Write a protein that binds this ligand. Sequence first.
Ligand code: CA
Ligand code: CA
Ligand code: CA
Length: 129
Amino acid sequence: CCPVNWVEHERSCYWFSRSGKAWADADNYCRLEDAHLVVVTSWEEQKFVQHHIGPVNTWMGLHDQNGPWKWVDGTDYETGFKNWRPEQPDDWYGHGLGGGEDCAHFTDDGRWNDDVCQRPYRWVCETEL
Ligand SMILES: [Ca+2]
Ligand SMILES: [Ca+2]
Ligand SMILES: [Ca+2]
C-alpha cells in the first residue's frame, strides 16, 4: 500500500510536491521519505507523471553530477528511456551562474532539460511497492 497523499501507478507510489527546492534538497527530501526522486523508464510512466505535474518545471532523479548521466536508484541511463527536448542535454554555461547544467527536469511540455542544480523547482518522489 502507498502512504496517504501518494498516488499509486503500476506498482509504484508517487508524491508530487507543490513547493520548490534545489535538486540536492529535493533528493534529500525523497530519501527521508524512504523514497527517491522519480526515475522514468517508459512512455507510460512519462505520460502518468506529466498528467500530475502539469506545465511546471519539475526535478526528476537524473543527474550528471561528477560523472556520466545516472538515475538516482542505479537504473542504467544509456540503455533506458529518454525524453530530452531536441538539442538537450547541452550542459549550458551561458546562464552565467558558474558551471554547466547537471540536473534533469521535466519542462512545461514534459520533455526533459538539463539545468543548474541550484534552481528551485517542484519535484516528484517515487517508491516501489
Ligand atoms: Ca519509475
Ligand atoms: Ca552536465
Ligand atoms: Ca539545458
